[PDB]
């Protein structure tokens, strides 16, 4: 019922405007808000009463209404402004109702390998006659990579749970990897290794039942 | 200031009720304009479910089938959300909202709870330390960990040194598994010097059951206790 662009980029300093138009009944008779939504996150009040901020909201965000629609207005365009923006008002009928939402892109960040932390499995899940290597993928850009597992030497495709990656904070993303065996598997290779391939090098970690570094 | 906090199991199953309450602080809640509820599926936008306001009259989303009731209890301070013969479509996150005035448009939102719609049961998690070793140091600092492992269902809340450890602290996002339950790891760095001579918890709360942890994660020694052991 309120329409906004469901995508919009720009490269970073650059000035952004998101746009929701509705009717004369809907945006026209009534005040405007604006949400960001970062991953995970609810919704934040970015602007209401048309164009007002919210204390703690930068000036980097503004809000304006040209008739039947209204307007978001980011300036300074940062990685930080990564999100989805949602505008809302009332209907005809006096009840809620959201744009559909906006996804934001920063363009033009630069590419950034990921680091992989590879924890064997603990004393403690080994008693209980379990084992559980963790690989952990942190702060790579952007947000793909695929997860190979071995055994010594060997592929392993059994027992492999990796999620798809999803953003983090500082807009890096993060992943991770789980390898299921049996206590008698880990004890009796050489050695494991996680290995995280992003856009094309591989980063690689390894843990060995032989291991004890104090 | 006026803050809002919903509460809810974050497990329904099909065609069961569910219950959800909102709990207003800072604010007499007969005095708000309106309060309501908004959801949001997994990646999807936000949907009306239903309002109320202070002349006590409700309004509710009509794609919801006469399924929505809200109420407030002005005893306890809180309003309340039941969404009736719920099917795997009302899976999303919930929100509850409020506008103080008629005559502005700054609403107050809860931080949202995840409701989970299945039959599957509760599991709380088995919690693991992921001990810090050579391997997982780098500079001079270490990385130690705990593993929370089979769970249901989301979320799972971990803090470190009961939240007085908050920097290089990541807490990853969780698995599913083919077997239907979940898996997450949480990782502190921490400096290495520090390692000998520090305790380092990880605190462990699975809300939707009733499950509460904490596992010590300490450095694995090297050397037998009962042999010299020093030059």
């Known amino acids: 019922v309120l329409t906004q662009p469901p995508s919009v980029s720009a490269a970073p300093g650059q000035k952004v405007t998101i746009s929701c138009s509705g009717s004369?009944?809907?945006?026209?008779?009534?005040?405007v808000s604006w949400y960001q939504q970062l991953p995970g996150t609810a919704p934040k009040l970015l602007i209401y009463?048309?164009?007002k901020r919210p204390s703690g909201i930068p000036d980097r965000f503004s809000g304006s209404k040209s008739g039947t629609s209204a307007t978001l207005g980011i300036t300074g365009l940062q990685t930080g402004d990564e999100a989805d923006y949602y505008c809302?008002?009332?209907?005809?009928?006096?009840?809620?109702?959201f744009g559909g939402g906006t996804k934001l892109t920063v363009l033009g960040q630069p590419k950034a390998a990921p680091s992989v932390t590879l924890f064997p499995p603990s004393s403690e899940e080994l008693q209980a006659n379990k084992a559980t290597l963790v690989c952990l993928i942190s702060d790579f850009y952007p947000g793909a990579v695929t997860v190979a597992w071995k055994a010594d030497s060997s592929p392993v495709k059994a027992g492999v749970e990796t999620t798809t990656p999803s953003k983090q904070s500082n807009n890096k993303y993060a992943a991770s990897s789980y390898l299921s065996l049996t206590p008698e598997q880990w004890k009796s290779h050489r050695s494991y290794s996680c290995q995280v391939t992003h856009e094309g090098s591989t980063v690689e970690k390894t843990v060995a039942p032989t291991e004890c570094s104090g | 200031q006026v803050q809002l906090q919903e509460s809810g199991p974050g497990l329904v199953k099909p065609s069961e009720t569910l219950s959800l309450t909102c709990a207003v602080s800072?604010?007499?809640?007969?005095?708000?304009?309106?309060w309501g509820w908004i959801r949001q599926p997994p990646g999807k936008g936000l949907e009306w479910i239903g309002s109320?306001?202070?002349?006590?009259?409700?309004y509710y989303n009509p794609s919801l089938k006469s399924r929505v009731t809200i109420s407030v209890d002005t005893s306890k301070n809180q309003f309340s959300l039941k969404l009736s013969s719920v099917t795997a479509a009302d899976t999303a996150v919930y929100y509850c909202?409020?506008?103080?005035?008629?005559?502005?448009?700054?609403?107050?939102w809860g931080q949202g709870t995840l409701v989970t719609v299945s039959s599957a049961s509760t599991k709380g998690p088995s919690v693991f330390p992921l001990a810090p070793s050579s391997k997982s140091t780098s500079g001079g600092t270490a990385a130690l960990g705990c593993l929370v492992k089979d769970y249901f269902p989301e979320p799972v809340t971990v803090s470190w040194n009961s939240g007085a450890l908050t920097s290089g602290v990541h807490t990853f996002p969780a698995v599913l598994q083919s077997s239907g339950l979940y898996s997450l790891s949480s990782v502190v760095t921490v400096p290495s010097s520090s390692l000998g001579t520090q305790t380092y918890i990880c605190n462990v709360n699975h809300k939707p059951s009733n499950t509460k942890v904490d596992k010590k994660v300490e450095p694995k020694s090297c050397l037998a206790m009962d042999y010299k052991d020093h030059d």
């Open positions: 809302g008002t009332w209907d005809s009928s006096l009840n809620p109702v």
């Open positions: 800072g604010y007499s809640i007969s005095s708000g304009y309106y």
């Open positions: 909202a409020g506008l103080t005035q008629s005559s502005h448009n700054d609403a107050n």
């Open positions: 109320i306001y202070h002349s006590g009259s409700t």
């Open positions: 004369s009944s809907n945006i026209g008779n009534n005040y």
């Open positions: 009463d048309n164009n």
